[PDB]
């Protein structure tokens, strides 16, 4: 297979963490493209990141990608990671665009930009909390994990925008980060700059 | 704008042949659907609800039968909720279905040859704006009109909904 990603794009940080899953039932090659190159014969404007199969089919939802290579692994679909995706997709997504926007494009500081985010990351802090288990939707690392700290890390990167209060949120985001693939997918998505990775891409 | 999620759940529970019951409570400024199961967690969101209901209704297929398939499922789910229900259908609908007619070109379903819980969706998501396109824009858009078709005519899946009228010209 062919996993298209391309420099300082934050969705290309959870299907690198996660492209490790496949080891074993399929190959992950990666190629990195400029964010103006349209890989996908069907849709008209670029999208980054994107899978082609094996079977020639193309998975251009980052959260997709993820799910693939955790079910080649063996994972089972439950609904707690579900109600995870579908919230990151749809609710936190939206909120780290604008904070993110503000620190890159506009660079704002402090409150100016964990503002836009604060009540969605006291909500993941809170149902670490009131949860007994240190991960998202259960006792080991998974699939929800790996989206949600793909989604939060180009923020929380730097310690400054990690609330001290949350310590459910700090500690699980700890554990995550220093994961061998997490540490590596960082690295390749950011390189030198943290967060100004983003900006060709956050406009 | 877009069905309300109850309305849109409820549905989904004909359409799976669901009883039933199940009562749905909403949440924050969009009203996500909230469902409390019976002896079991809370489940937020549309499609994860709709994930649930269609295994309440032993109907576990309908999510993909293989890791490829399931995860094709999931892509078309979100792009139902992000694309189809979100900024980009209400700012530029004919580049969605540019893209989705493209996409149908060789396709029977959305994942292929399998009916899946994606081709339900996408259908009752997409009605409000195909049972207003013209008679040249159904010919334009060849592909998504045919897929459209097939799942409008598909057992229990059209429910209340219009019927939208196609006419092949070949």
Redesign the interface.
């Known amino acids: 297979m062919r996993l298209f990603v391309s420099d300082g794009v934050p969705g290309c940080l959870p299907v690198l963490a996660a492209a490790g899953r496949a080891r074993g039932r399929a190959e992950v090659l990666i190629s990195t493209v400029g964010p103006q190159d349209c890989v996908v ?5 670029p999208k980054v990141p994107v899978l082609q ?1 094996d ?1 020639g ?1 193309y ?3 980052t ?3 993820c ?2 290579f955790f ?2 692994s063996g994972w089972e ?1 439950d ?2 990671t ?2 995870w ?3 990151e ?2 609710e936190l997504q939206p909120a780290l665009s604008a904070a993110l926007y503000y620190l890159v494009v506009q660079g704002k500081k402090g409150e100016d930009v964990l503002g836009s985010v604060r009540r969605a990351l006291t909500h993941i802090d809170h149902s670490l909390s009131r949860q007994n288990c240190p991960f998202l939707a259960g006792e080991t690392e998974s699939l929800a994990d790996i989206v949600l700290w793909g989604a939060l890390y180009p923020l929380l990167q730097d310690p400054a925008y990690l609330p001290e209060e949350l310590s459910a949120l700090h500690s699980w985001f700890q554990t995550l980060s220093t994961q061998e693939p997490c540490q590596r997918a960082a690295q390749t998505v950011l390189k030198q700059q943290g967060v100004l990775a983003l900006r060709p891409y956050l406009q | 704008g877009h069905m309300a999620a109850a309305a849109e759940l409820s549905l989904l529970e004909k359409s799976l042949g669901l009883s039933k019951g199940n009562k749905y409570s909403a949440q924050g400024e969009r009203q996500i659907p909230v469902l409390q199961t019976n002896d079991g967690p809370s489940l937020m969101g549309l499609t994860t609800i709709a994930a649930h209901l269609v295994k309440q209704a032993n109907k576990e297929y309908l999510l993909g039968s293989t890791a490829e398939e399931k995860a094709m499922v999931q892509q078309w789910l979100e792009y139902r909720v992000t694309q189809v229900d979100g900024h980009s259908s209400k700012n530029d609908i004919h580049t969605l279905l540019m893209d989705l007619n493209s996409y149908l070109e060789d396709k029977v379903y959305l994942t292929g040859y399998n009916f899946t819980l994606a081709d339900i969706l996408l259908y009752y998501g997409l009605h409000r704006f195909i049972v207003d396109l013209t008679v040249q824009e159904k010919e334009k858009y060849l592909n998504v009109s045919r897929w459209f078709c097939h799942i409008q005519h598909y057992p229990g899946i059209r429910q209340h909904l219009s019927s939208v009228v196609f006419i092949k010209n070949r």
């Open positions: 014969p069907f849709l008209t404007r199969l079977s089919n998975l251009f939802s959260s997709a990608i799910r693939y079910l080649l679909q609904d707690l579900n109600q995706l579908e919230w997709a749809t």
